[PDB]
Each structure stands twice: as structure tokens, then as C-alpha cells.
Design a protein around this ligand. Structure first.
Ligand SMILES: [Cu+2]
Ligand SMILES: [Cu+2]
Ligand SMILES: [Cu+2]
Ligand SMILES: [Cu+2]
Ligand SMILES: [Cu+2]
Ligand SMILES: [Cu+2]
Ligand code: NA
Ligand code: NA
Lengths: 439, 439
């Protein structure tokens, strides 16, 4: 096959993407060993769905797992009556998700389970895939002539040829695995044929962070979770928290081999020690550095010029309300709270009005990083930790370090009941989720 | 003094730059040895004059040389009755140049002798300095916060503590020297204090070319000879032919020492050999690589973003005439021709009309590179060698390799008699110059 493994793509045909997926335990070869994973479509990652605005998606999910499951269309501003976080598909049953892709949309999205209390083991076991909304902007020459690749960043740990079970400490920290994979492959080689790459990046890990840096190169950020930036932004490294996506251009500068690495990053995960008195929680400290892939540049590379502009960011109406959502932890209990409460699917926490704009101030009063996710309603990050964000783009996950406040501008789009939650999915399963109702 | 030597600057005061310079033989220390040079203002290079649009310049040149001399205000679109290539200032006499800096002007210019038949030894001996027209564009933050430096690139050879005399081969090739200097200094160190540098580059050499490359970095071209580009242009190297200027931004990428080099370049200079039959002319081949300066980056450099735009290039009226000027050589005679003739100050070669636009096709039918210069009327290079130029900017020198045609758009500005000539100044002295009259 290709040097660079990527999930097989399913494209809409004549404006319709009609597909039956099964969620199933699946023997496969991964990272050179046999294992049984839980997969969509028989593969890990699941197939990449590639659509355009105004396409119809008709996805029938057949549940062949021994437990109930459902799908969250992560990042898509569609109705929560379709992207329904409360729906349960029992074992052996099927459900058809049907929606129209919004007109004003572009970027990399993804799909995964969202059945409260079961997300973390289902996602860890292999249930996830990408969705790409292709744009008329992809025809500008500076993007069309780039070599495009999707990188699904997701780690795994195997025990007995199956995903390793969750321990108590995994429920507290979020589970990370020792196999740090790209598109299900261990440290693949990307032999570039063009001097400009356009990389779609997805962090589909339960809890692992990827502090991305390409040796000897900057990255040019051109899209965040839910859409393009207004113009490319040069960065020396890019932190992708669980659930985040980004698209970057890479402008290869000379022949050679360059490592794409996940550089050491301390997200506040905790261990336990006993030193005589004790036992007490102690910080795990930074992650060990990981090589994600080997990038081989072509001979005599001469990258394209960068595009001068991408997409203008919408002018939003003035906001009508300011919310404040405070995140806290009880680590030894592995319990996690928003404004002092755990999730209750019967309780509405916030009630807002469709087509108004809200300011949400999300404050992390814990010691771990928490990546905050809001379904259905993409947002503009104004500032985090008191620092203004350096670009305007739609996001749907924002990472908060310990102590930091994020200020978000949140246009409320579709009516209905939806959720917001930490995207360290163990923390959502353990209570860090609340209910927004839009009317 | 500073780590980085630069010529002392004289600024206009209250809109007036009024200065008396003397052209004089001057004992000085240069490159660690004593020598007597010919200088303006007692220094090598001469002082940098720094003015703004609509300033008055009143420059009295006192000739203290044993031969006549004059000044050419290289690149300034002023009247040829001021920038007068036929004027002679006898030994011991003085002349006052007085002009107003044009409103729509910015960049790096320079001044040097232009007395036909004596330019090459006078310029080689040290008579040159820079003129900077500062712009309201210099206040945009991406330029204002950059560290600015002028680099006058000019080589020298010394014999007996004086500039080495011209040999016959020097008149054929143009004279190059073994001391390859920046601002009169041998391989200075530039210890950068900011992460973004704005370097004004001037090739004031008689004949040496500088194929410029900074180790491990691109250069961002922001101005050509006579004005800004429309937006910055990333280049991996930049060839500066005699008389050319450029301004580049340098975005320092990491701590360390980086060489600015003049990389090997073959301009077609010729030597002589005798191998049994013979003696016959033989190519000298490429120049040896030279280190121009050592650039030390600061700690933890974080360059500014590049400016998105600089200056829009004027929309020019449609042209009313196409000229064709063919350059040829008689190397063994050291004679050089345009359309088959040598310069004659009494003969008008071209007659054009003020405020019309002309297309000039300049064709190098020789084997050497020839950098073609037009006084008084800056031009837009459309293409050279059949390749479209990748930016729009005012130029006044265009380099032609052997066989190449340059197509130039030439708006005729001030009325009067002026000249065009090769800026390998030995070739101008030996006849490669003609007369344009604008009415
Ligand atoms: Cu998600
Ligand atoms: Cu969390
Ligand atoms: Cu969710
Ligand atoms: Cu000149
Ligand atoms: Cu010439
Ligand atoms: Cu001249
Ligand atoms: Na299957
Ligand atoms: Na003097």
C-alpha cells in the first residue's frame, strides 16, 4: 500500500452520503500485533466521510456491541434532535442519522460514541472516525496544489490482545496508552511528493495531549476545530487537546528526514506515592517525548506561496448574556463538577435563546488541564488565561490550564437540549457535563 | 564603537539637508591597514544622507581631486539638469546640487562620480555613499519595530597603500578586488538585538556581483532599487548586480551564528591562457565564495509577523513606443556597444516624450552579464530572459545574463538629456552608454 496509511474515504455521491456502519468487535492487525478492537466499518480508525455543504448524510449505525451506544457528530452545528446525546441504541438495534450539511461550513470533524458513563471505554477501544467538509476554498491554487493528508492522533494500550481495561487512576486522569499511533499505524513514514503539505490533524485520544512540532520547521495554521482562520498563522508548535482539530500547511525547506514529534507536556495527571508518611497524590509531570511520524522531504523542494487570505470570520451580533461555568475536581473520588454539580440528564443547567450571542466565561479551578467542549453551537475563543487569542475561527473545544479563564463568544444556533462537557472523556463519564436548552 | 560599523548619517533638518562635501584623497585605516582612498566627507563609504519626500537637498561638492569629477544621484527621478551626467567640476572648483525630493518616493539610493572615462578609477578608489528616502510606510509596526541596518557592499584591492591601478584586463572585465567589505569593514559581526532585521543592501562595487544567502534563512524582499514591492516576497537567495539596491527583512529563527555569504556566481569574466597554440580568452568561471558578515541571533528570537502589504504599484498608462537596445562586446579591444555604437556625448540616440510610457527591450548579445542602468526615469521590469518578474517595484538597474532580453516599462518623467549605460562602470567608460532626450 502507500507509505502513509490513511483511513479509507467514503464520498457523497450526487449530494447524498448514504452508508450503513456497524459498531463491532473486530480482529485486526495493528502496530504489528493482532488485537480485537471495537470499530466502525471494520477498521481503526473508522472510514473518513467526505462531504460538501448542503449534502444529505444518511448514516445507519448498527450496534453490534454488547452494550448500548450512540454517535456524536462532533463539531457539526446541526440539530440536537439528530446529534442527540441522550439517545441509546441497544445491542443489536440500528438507528439512522439523517441531516443536511450546513451551507457555511468547512473543516475536519469527527464521530464517536456519546452514551454517558460508557464513552471512555468505547472510544478507547477504537470507536472513532473523521468527517471532512470540503470547501470551495480548497480550489484556490495555494491549497489545491498542496499534498493533503489526514492525521488521526490516537493512542492505545493492549492487554491480552484487547484494549487494556480502565483502572481507578485512569478514571481520575483519563487513560493514555503506550502505543502512540497515527491513523492506527506506529510511527509511519510520510514520503512527501510535493513541497507543500496540507495536514488535517485530529486528536481522537481519550486524554493524551499532542504538543506538536516538526523538526526544523514552523507550522502554518489555516483552520481550527470548526473552520478556517482568516489568514494563515505561523506557529512554532501546536498543542492539540483531546477532541481538537487543526489544519496546517507545512512548507518543506530542504531535502531530508524530519521528525513530527509530540513534545513533553504536563497536563496535570497525578500518581500516588508513599514515602514514609503518606500515601499522597503526586504530579506525574510532563509526558515523555514521542515521535509521531517520519516526514521525508522531496528533492529540491520549492513550496508554494502561502494563501494571503482564507475565510473572513463572521461579524457577530452583540451578546445578550454572560455565563460563568466553574470547573472543579475531587481527584481521589474521581469526581468532576461544573458550578459545583455533576451531570444529571433530567436537569437543565442553562437556558438560552436561539440566534442570540452569549459570552461564556469558563474557569478551570482544578489543577489538571480540562478541554471544554460544547455540542451543536461552535464558538469564537476571545481569550484564555487573560491572553487574547491570535486568530478568529470557529472552535468547539477549548483547553484550559489550571487556573485559566476562557472567554468564549457563543452564537446559539439550533433549538433543543444539548450538552457541554470536558473532553477528557473519563471526566465526562464521571460527571463533568451539563445541559443547555436553547429555545 | 558598535559591533556593526555603518556610515555616519546626515539627516535633513526642518525639511532642508544643506551639506558641503569634499571629494579628497584621505589617509584612513581600512580592513586593518592604512591606506589613502578617495573619499567624500573624509570617510569610506561617504556619509549616508537621510531625507524625506519634499525635503530640499542642497549639496555643495568641492572637488579636491587632481582630476575633474561630478555626482550622479543614482536612482533619483529628478531633473537631468541637476543630475547632470555631462557636467564637469574641475580640480579645486565646487558645484551646488539643489533639488526637491519627489513626493512619491521611498527606498535606498546612492551617489557616486559620473564623469565619462573616469568613473571606474574614481568609484574604485572609494567615492560613493548612500541616500535613504524615509517613508510613512516605515511607521507601520512590522517595520518600525525591526532593527534597521545599511549594508554597503563594495570590494577593494590595495597596492602600495593606495587603490590598485586598473590593468587592461580590468577594463575588459570590470575590476574586482580581494578585500570584500561591508561598510568598509572586513567581515564585521552584526550582533542582532531584535529578532527581525530590516537590511538596506547596496552593491556599490565596480563589477563584483553578490549572490546573497544567509545560512539557514530565507530573505523577505520588501524593496527593489527604487521603491517598495507591493507585498513581501520570500526568496532563498538574492543576486545584487553592480548599482542595484534591495531591502530585505530577516526573521531570525533560533539562537546562533549565521554567515551572510556571497555565493559562487559566474558573470562571464574572462582570462587568457596559452596551452601550446593559443593565446586565447578563457572563462574565469564562478567567483569564490565570500563571507560578508557574521550575524549573531539574540536569545529566544520571536520575529514580528511580516507586513501583509507594502505599497501598491502605480497603474501605468498604455505605452506609445517600443525600443530595442542590443548590447554587444569586443572583449579583446575592451570595447562595448549599444546598437552597434559607442557613446558620443554629442549624439542623441533616443528621443521620447515626457509623461508617456515606453517599452524598452534590452538584449544582451554578449557573453558577460551586463547590468543596464537608465538615469532619471525608473522603470518596471516586466520580464527577463522570457521569465515574468515575480513582483512589481521601481528599478533603475536590471541585470542581463548572456543572451537574455529584458522587457521594461519606462515612464518618461523629467524633460532633458540623460544617459543609459552598463553599470559595470569600466564598460561605460569604454563606451557602453547612449543618450536619451525627453521633450
Ligand atoms: Cu467529541
Ligand atoms: Cu476534564
Ligand atoms: Cu459530547
Ligand atoms: Cu550608479
Ligand atoms: Cu557591461
Ligand atoms: Cu550613469
Ligand atoms: Na464490522
Ligand atoms: Na575630506
Amino acid at each position: 500500500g502507500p507509505s502513509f496509511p490513511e483511513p479509507k474515504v467514503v464520498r457523497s455521491q450526487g449530494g447524498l452520503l448514504s452508508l450503513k456502519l456497524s459498531a463491532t468487535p473486530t480482529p485486526l492487525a495493528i502496530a504489528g500485533q493482532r488485537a480485537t478492537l471495537l470499530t466502525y466499518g471494520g477498521s481503526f480508525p473508522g472510514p473518513t466521510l467526505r462531504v460538501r455543504p448542503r449534502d444529505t448524510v444518511r448514516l445507519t449505525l448498527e450496534n453490534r456491541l454488547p452494550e448500548p451506544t450512540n454517535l456524536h457528530w462532533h463539531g457539526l452545528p446541526i440539530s440536537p434532535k439528530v446529534d442527540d446525546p441522550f439517545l441509546e441504541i441497544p445491542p443489536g438495534e440500528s438507528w439512522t442519522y439523517e441531516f443536511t450539511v450546513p451551507k457555511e461550513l468547512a473543516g475536519t470533524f469527527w464521530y464517536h460514541p456519546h452514551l454517558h458513563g460508557r464513552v471512555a471505554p468505547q472510544l478507547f477501544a477504537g470507536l472513532l472516525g473523521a468527517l471532512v467538509v470540503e470547501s470551495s476554498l480548497d480550489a484556490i491554487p495555494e491549497l489545491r496544489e498542496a499534498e493533503e493528508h489526514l492525521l488521526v492522533l490516537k493512542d492505545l494500550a493492549l492487554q491480552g490482545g484487547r484494549p487494556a481495561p480502565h483502572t481507578p487512576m485512569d478514571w481520575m486522569n483519563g487513560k493514555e496508552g503506550d502505543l502512540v499511533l497515527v491513523n492506527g499505524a506506529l510511527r509511519p513514514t510520510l514520503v512527501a511528493q510535493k513541497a507543500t503539505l496540507r495536514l488535517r490533524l485530529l486528536n481522537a485520544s481519550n486524554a493524551r495531549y499532542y504538543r506538536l512540532a516538526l523538526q526544523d520547521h514552523p507550522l502554518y495554521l489555516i483552520a481550527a476545530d470548526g473552520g478556517f482562520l482568516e489568514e494563515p498563522l505561523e506557529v512554532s508548535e501546536l498543542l492539540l487537546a483531546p477532541g481538537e482539530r487543526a489544519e496546517v500547511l507545512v512548507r518543506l525547506r530542504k531535502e531530508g528526514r524530519f521528525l513530527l514529534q509530540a513534545l513533553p507536556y504536563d497536563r496535570g495527571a497525578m500518581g500516588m506515592m508513599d514515602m514514609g508518611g503518606m500515601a499522597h497524590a503526586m504530579p506525574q509531570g510532563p509526558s515523555r517525548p514521542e515521535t509521531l511520524l517520519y516526514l521525508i522531504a522531496p528533492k529540491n523542494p520549492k513550496p508554494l506561496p502561502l494563501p494571503k487570505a482564507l475565510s473572513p470570520f463572521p461579524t457577530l451580533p452583540a451578546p445578550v448574556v454572560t455565563r460563568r461555568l466553574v470547573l472543579t475536581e475531587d481527584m481521589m473520588a474521581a469526581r468532576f463538577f461544573i458550578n459545583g454539580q455533576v451531570f444529571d440528564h433530567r436537569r437543565v443547567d442553562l437556558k438560552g435563546q436561539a440566534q442570540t450571542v452569549e459570552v461564556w466565561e469558563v474557569e478551570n479551578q482544578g489543577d489538571m488541564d480540562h478541554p471544554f467542549h460544547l455540542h451543536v453551537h461552535p464558538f469564537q475563543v476571545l481569550s484564555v488565561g487573560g491572553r487574547p487569542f491570535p486568530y478568529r475561527a470557529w472552535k468547539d473545544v477549548v483547553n484550559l490550564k489550571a487556573g485559566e479563564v476562557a472567554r468564549l463568544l457563543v452564537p446559539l444556533r439550533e433549538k433543543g437540549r444539548t450538552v457541554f462537557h470536558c473532553h477528557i472523556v473519563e471526566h465526562e463519564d464521571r460527571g463533568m457535563m451539563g445541559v443547555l436548552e436553547v429555545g
